[PDB]
Symmetry: D2
Subunit: 406 residues, 4 copies
Amino acid sequence: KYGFDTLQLHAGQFVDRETKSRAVPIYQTTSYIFEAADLFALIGNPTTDVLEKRIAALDGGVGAVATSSGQAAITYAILNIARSGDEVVAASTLYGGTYTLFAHTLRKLGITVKFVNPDYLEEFEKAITDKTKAIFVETLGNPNINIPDFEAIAEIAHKHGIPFIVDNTFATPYLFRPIEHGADIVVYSMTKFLGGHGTSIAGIVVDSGKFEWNEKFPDLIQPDPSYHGLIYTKEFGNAAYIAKLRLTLLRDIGACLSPFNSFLVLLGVETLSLRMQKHVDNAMKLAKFLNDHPKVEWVNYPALEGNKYYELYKKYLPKGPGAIFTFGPKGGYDAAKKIINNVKLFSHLANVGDAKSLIIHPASTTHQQLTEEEQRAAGVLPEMIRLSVGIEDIEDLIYDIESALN
Amino acid sequence: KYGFDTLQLHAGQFVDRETKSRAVPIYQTTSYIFEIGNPTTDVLEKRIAALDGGVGAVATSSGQAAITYAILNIARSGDEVVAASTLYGGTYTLFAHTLRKLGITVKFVNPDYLEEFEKAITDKTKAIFVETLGNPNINIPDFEAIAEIAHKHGIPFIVDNTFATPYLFRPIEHGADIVVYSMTKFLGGHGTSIAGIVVDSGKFEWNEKFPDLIQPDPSYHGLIYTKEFGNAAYIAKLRLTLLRDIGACLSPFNSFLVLLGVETLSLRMQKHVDNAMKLAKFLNDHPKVEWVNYPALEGNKYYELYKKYLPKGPGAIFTFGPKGGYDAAKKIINNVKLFSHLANVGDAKSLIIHPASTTHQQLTEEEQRAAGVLPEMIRLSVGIEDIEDLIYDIESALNKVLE
Amino acid sequence: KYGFDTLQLHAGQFVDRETKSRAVPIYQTTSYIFEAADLFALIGNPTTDVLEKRIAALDGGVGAVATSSGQAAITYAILNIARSGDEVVAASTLYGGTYTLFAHTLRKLGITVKFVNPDYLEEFEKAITDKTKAIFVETLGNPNINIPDFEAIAEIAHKHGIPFIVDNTFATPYLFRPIEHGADIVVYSMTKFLGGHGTSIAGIVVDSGKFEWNEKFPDLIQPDPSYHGLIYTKEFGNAAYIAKLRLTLLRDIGACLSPFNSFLVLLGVETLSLRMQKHVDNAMKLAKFLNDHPKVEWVNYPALEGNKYYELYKKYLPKGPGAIFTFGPKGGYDAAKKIINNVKLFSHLANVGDAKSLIIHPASTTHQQLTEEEQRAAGVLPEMIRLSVGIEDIEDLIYDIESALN
Amino acid sequence: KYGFDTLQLHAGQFVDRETKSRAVPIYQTTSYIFEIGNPTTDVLEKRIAALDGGVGAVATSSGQAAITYAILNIARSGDEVVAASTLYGGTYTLFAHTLRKLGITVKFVNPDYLEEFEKAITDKTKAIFVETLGNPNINIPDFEAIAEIAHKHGIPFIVDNTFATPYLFRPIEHGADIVVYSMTKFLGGHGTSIAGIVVDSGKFEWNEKFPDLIQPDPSYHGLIYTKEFGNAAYIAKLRLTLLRDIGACLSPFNSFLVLLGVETLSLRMQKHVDNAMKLAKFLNDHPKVEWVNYPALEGNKYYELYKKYLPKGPGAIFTFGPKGGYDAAKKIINNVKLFSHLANVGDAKSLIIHPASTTHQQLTEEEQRAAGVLPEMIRLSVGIEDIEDLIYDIESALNKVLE
C-alpha cells in the first residue's frame, strides 16, 4: 500500500531486462517479433501500458485503455456497452465536444442520449428506460462548475442494473477518486490537467472491475464471434469491460495513442500531486480576491461560501473543487472583452488544464454565432469570463487581472 | 506543375515566418492563442492530397480510424456499404462486427464477379469499398468497371490503396472518389508510426442519398457543406464533425515521422517492387515451391489487370506455398535469419508470416480455407534489402525442408 | 518583476507568429532559409533559445548557452577564458567526471588545474599565480556535501581580477542563486535536478554580465581574427563572455543540445520550484530519521545540528541544502551492501537528481577498483551509502530503508 | 556476409528481449540500474562501422565534435596535424583558432601537391587530415598516395567523408585509418538532426608517437588500450576519455532520426548523383554559364581521380559561375522557387548559396578569392527532386539574368 506520490512516480513501470533503463523507453514501433498463435488466440504498446497501469493504480481500478483524445475515450466508453437502439442518460452540463458527440454523432449511430439537469435526481430516474445502458456525468460540469451528488446518482444507476460513468478530467485522481463514490467507469482527457503541460492530446478509460455485467450487456456475458465464441466475464474476470474495449473498439476503430504522447503525459503524471495542489491553492486565492473586488459583479466557484455546490465541494472535493471558475465584471459584455484584450500573463485560448493560466470570453469567441437566449440556455452569460488557473505566482495573476479590471 | 519526386519532398510544406526552419517543425501543442487541425499534420495531409490528385485529406490515428471515418462520414444506422470479401482481417471485423453494432450492414461480394456488386446494391447502400491489392489473395479488382457501377447508382467508390501508395497507383485516375491509406505501412515505410488518412478527390456530386452534405448541419450552426466548401464538402464534414466528435487524431510527432518516410516514397517503392518481382520469380521456379500468387507472374488470373492498373509492379506483397504443407511452412518461418517473423506489412525490412501456425491457428483447416488462408500459405512483405541476401535467406530456409 | 514560479513557466517563451502555439514547438531542423550576409557578419536553435533565456532569468544573468552535457558546459566555461599554459584554481571536492576532466583531459591541452581544500580560504589565495584565469567550486561538493563560503571565495577571486565559476547542479536556482553571492559564471548539469525526470543529458553556462573583462583575458578585449577583428566587449557589452562562448566554442567544438532534449528539460523547469521543495522536505525528514536510528552510525547532511556546514546551510541554502546526503550503517562494508541489495523503492544506479529516489554504495561499485587509502582520500568510507532523495511519499522511503536496515 | 543495402537497414540492430520491438526503441534515459554509451546510439555506431568496414565507431553531438574528438584522441598541447587547405569553414576555424589556443599547431598544405604534405610533416606531427571532396573547390585528393606518406612517418590518415558517405566511397579501402562524418548532412539526409561520428578501421599499429595508447592511462585505472582492446584501442580511448570528460554526446532521439535516414542511404545517394550529373551537364552547356566545377565533367582537373576513387559519382555538390559576375549570382539566388537559399548541404532537398553576397560578404573581393571563393561562385547541393523541375527552376532563374 504505497502513497499517491510514490504511485504517480513508479506505478506500472517495470525495468527493461535488455538495457535496465530507469526512464520509460519510447517504443516508437508498429510491430514486435514473435516467439505467435497463442498471442492472437488470447493490441497495445509497452510505453502506453505504463501510463495505462499508472492511471488505473491512482484511481484504484483493475485496468485502463489510453486513446488518441478525451473525445475518443468518451466515444469508446459508451460504444463498449451501447449499440444502435440503446440509450444513455447524461447530465446536460457537459463539455461542448461531449454534447455534440452525444446529441449528433452518436444519435446518427442509433444511440439516443437523454440529457437531464444533474441538480435534480428525480430527473435521472424519470429518464431511465428498458433501453438505457449507462448514466454519464462530469465531476465539475461545463460551463457552470456544478458538482453532482455522485453517491445518490450511483445508487440510482445500480438500482436499475446500469454502470455509472464519471468524466474526471477537471479534478484528476489527486482531487477526486470517483470509484470511492460509486463510479464503475472513469474517463479523462489527459490532454488537460493529467498531462499538465499543454503538449499532448490523449484520453483514457478506467474500469473499476466493480460492476457485475448482467443480461442488459449480452456482448460481455455471451460468446463473441470475432474471437471465436470468447466470453469476456469468463476469460478476463472482473476486467471483462476494459478487455472487450481493447480487443473490439481499439482493434476496430483504432483511436490509439502514439507512444511519444504516452511518454510526455507520463512526465506530467510524475508531478500530478504537486501541480494540482498548486492549481487549487491559486484558484481559491484568486476566486476569494475577485469575490471581494468592487469591479466584479459575481464569482462562480464552489469553494466560496454561498455557492449552491459549497456543501458538495466539502464532501466530495475537500482539497479544492478544481482550478476552473467563471466571474462577471461590472460593465457587461464590453467590459469582459476589454479584460481579455488587456491581460498580459493569462493566455487567450479555448482550452483548459495547462500549467499556464488561461482566459476566455465565450460570448465574444466560442459562442459568438449563437443568440443570447441560446447562450444563456448553454450556461453562457454576456459578462462571463472563464479562468483556468495555472501554477504561476498568485501575486502575478492577481496583479495581471487587477490591472485589466482597472 | 511539379513531378512526383518533387511533391513527395515539397508539397504542403511552407517556410515558417518566425524561424524560417527548412525542416517541418514538430508542433507538439494542445492549443493556439486567438487573434480542428495541426500545422505539422497539415503538411502531410496536403502532401498526400497532391500525390493522389485530391482536393484535400484528413489524417487519423490509424488506417482503421481512416476507414471508420471514411464510412461514418456518409453512412448512419440503417444504411449499407458493399465491400469486397478480400479484406485485411481488421477491416472485416470493423465492417462485420463494430459497424453492425452501429446499425450499418456491410454486404460482402466476390470482387472477381462485377455482377455480384450490382446484385448487392439496394436503396439504402451509401458506398462501394475495395482494396487495390486484396488480403490475402493479392487480387486486383476492375476499378473503372466497379466505379461505373457505383456512379450508375449515385454512390462514391472508396479504395484502400495501402498496399500500392500513389507511386504505384492513383485510384482517382481510374474512378475512385475517396482514397484511404494505412500510412503505418508503405507510406510510412520505417515501421515506427501508426497513422491513417482519408483523401477526397472532390470529383463526386453529392445527392439526396447523402442529406447531411446537401442540407443544413445542426452539428455546425446550420451550415451547408456543398455551399460553403464546394467540391471539398465531404473532407470538410469529416474534419468538422467526426475528427472533432470522435477525436481519432494523429500525433504531430507521428506526422513528422511519416513525412520523413514520404520524402523517399518513389525511391523505396521502386526497390520494393524490383526485389518483390525477382524473388516472386525465384520461388516460382524453385522445386520445393508448389505455387506462388503474385499478379506479375505469367499465368496468374490478375496479370492483364497488373499490366493495366499497376505497370510499375503490383505492390511488394505475395503468397507462396511450399511442397510439404503446414510443416514445411512452419520450418521456413523458424529458419529465416533476415526476414522478420511478425504480423505487420509495409516496412523497409522484409517480413514473413505463416498465418496457419500463427494468426489463424485457432480456426480449423476448413475455417482457414473459407477465409482464403491455405494451410501451407506463407505471406511475404518484400523489403529494400539486397535481393541476393533475401534469395539466399529463403533458399537457406528451403534447404531445411524435405522433398 | 515576476515571481520565480511565473519565470520557470513563461521566461524566454515568445508565441510563434505563424501558428500562435501555446507550447514551445520542437524545431528539429539543421538549417533555416535566408532573407544572409548580415547574419554571418554578426549558432543557435529557437527551442533551445527559450531554455537558455529561462535559466538566465531564474539565475538573474544576462544570457546562457545550452550544451550536450554538464561535462561539455564545464569544458566550455573553462576553455572560453583559459588557453594552453593558463591555470585554474578548483575545490578538490569535485564530481568524478569534473576531476578527470580537470586532472587529465585539460592538463593534456596545457591547462593546469590546481586543486585546493575549499574549507581553507588561505589555500585558494596561496594557489593563485600570474597564469590563473578563474576559481571554480561546486555549491555542494562531492562526495562530502561540503558548502564553500561563496562570498569570501568571491572576494579573493575579484581582488586578483579573475572570475568565480560556480557549478550549481545539486541546488538549482530555486535553492541557491550563486550570482547573489559573488559568482560571475554559473554551470549546470541540467541532466540532474533542473531537468528532473532522468530523461535528457544536457548542460548550460550562465554569464552574470557582472565581470569587467581585463588584460588577463585578451581574447575578450582584443580583435578576434575568426570574425575579422571583432571585439566582444564592444559588440556584446556586458554579455561579451557568453557571446564569445557561442561564436567560438559552440561553433568550433559543436557540443550542441538537440532541440528535443531542450524541449524535455523545459517540461522539468516548468515544475522546478514544486519538485525541489518536495526534494528538500523529503531529504531533511529522511536525514533526521537516519540520524536518530540505532542501526545507523553517522549521517552527513548540512541541515543536521552538529554538521561543520550547518552555519553555511542557514546562510546560503536556507530552503534546504539540496536532497543528496551520505550515511554509514553499523556493520561496515558488508552491512552497506545488504542495504543496496534489500531496498525495493530506491533504485540502484550511479546518477543523482532524478524525481525517483536513488541509492549507491560507492566502495562496492564506482570506487571498487581503488584501495581503501585511495577511497578515503577521495572522500569514500567503506560503510558510506549516498542517497539522492526523490519526491515519493516520505513514509514509503522511510519504510523501504527501515526494512533494509532490519 | 551481407551487401550494402542490407547492412544500411539491419547492421547493429538487435531485437529487444523485453518487448521484441522491430523498430529501434528510443532510450531517452540518463541512467541504467546496476546488476559511456546508449543502446539506440549503439545501433547507429555499429551500423556506420559495418558500412565503412571499421572495427567500431563513437557518435558525437556534431561533425565539429567528431573532428575535435578524432584529433584530441591522439594530439595534445605542443603537437601538430597536417591538414588540406581545402576545408569546410568550420573545420578551418576549429584547426586555426580553437586547436591553436589548446597548443595544437595545424599546418595547412595545397592537397594537389603530394610533396607539400611530406614538407609539412615534422617530429611532432600526429596525423594527416583531408576531406574526400574539399570545400568549396570540390577537389579529390590522392588518398592512397597521401596514406603512404602518413604510413611512411608512422601516423594515421584521417578522412572527412561527409560529402560522399560509405555508399560513394569507403576511405578504409584506399588507406584511411580513421574516418569522420557530419551525419547532419547526407548520412542523415532529411535536414532534421545535427550529429557526428568517428570510425576506427583498427588497421593502424600505434607506436611511441602515441604514448597514451601503448602506455598505462592514469585516467582509466592504469589500463593499456592496445592490451585490453587490441585493434580497437583508438576508438575505446576516445569513448572512455574524451566522450566521458568533454561529453559532446549524441541525443538518443537524434540517433533514431539519423538511423531512419541511413535505412535509405544507397537509394537517396544514387538519386543525388544521378540528379547532380545531369544538372552539372545542363549548366556546363548553358550560354549564361562561364564555368562549372564538378570532377565528373570532362576537362576538370580531378576527372581521372573521380573515375578511380568515386566511379558511382563524385558526390552531389558542385560550384558554377554565371557570365555576369556577383550581380547575376545574386539575381539567380533571388529568383529560384524550388532550390532553398540556406548555408547547409546534404539535405534530400536541393540547396543553393552565393557565398560572396552571404557568408563571405564581409571579406574584400581579394580576401574571398584567397579562401577559394570567386565573386560569381554559386554552390549547389543537388537534392532527390525530379531533375526536370530542378533544370526548369535554374533555367527560369537564368532567364532573369542579362547577356
